[PDB]
């Protein structure tokens, strides 16, 4: 489909549209690299990047810092 989609499949990694629609924006802009995405899933020991992973990822790396409260 695309570079991002092909990049994952290259390492036997799959991605859902729910996460692609979001991860694409953070990937296309040049925020995170493919190497970082795979490094995250590695710690989780999984070959499926779903919305749950995408959320924890950006939250782990420290990106998209936009919260209504923002405490700590």
From Swiss-Prot:
It comes from the Archaea. Signal peptide: none annotated. Possesses two activities: a DNA synthesis (polymerase) and an exonucleolytic activity that degrades single-stranded DNA in the 3' to 5' direction. Has a template-primer preference which is characteristic of a replicative DNA polymerase. Heterodimer of a large subunit and a small subunit. Belongs to the DNA polymerase delta/II small subunit family. This is DNA polymerase II small subunit. It comes from Pyrococcus horikoshii (strain ATCC 700860 / DSM 12428 / JCM 9974 / NBRC 100139 / OT-3). The gene is polB. The chain holds residues 1 to 72 of 622 of the full protein.
């Amino acid at each position: 489909m695309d570079e991002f989609v092909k990049g994952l499949m290259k390492n036997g990694y799959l991605i859902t549209p729910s996460a692609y629609y979001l991860l694409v924006g953070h990937f296309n802009e040049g925020k995170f690299s493919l190497i970082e995405l795979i490094k995250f899933a590695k710690s989780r020991e999984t070959f499926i990047i779903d919305d749950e992973i995408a959320n924890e990822f950006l939250k782990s790396i420290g990106a998209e810092v936009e919260l209504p409260q923002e405490i700590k």
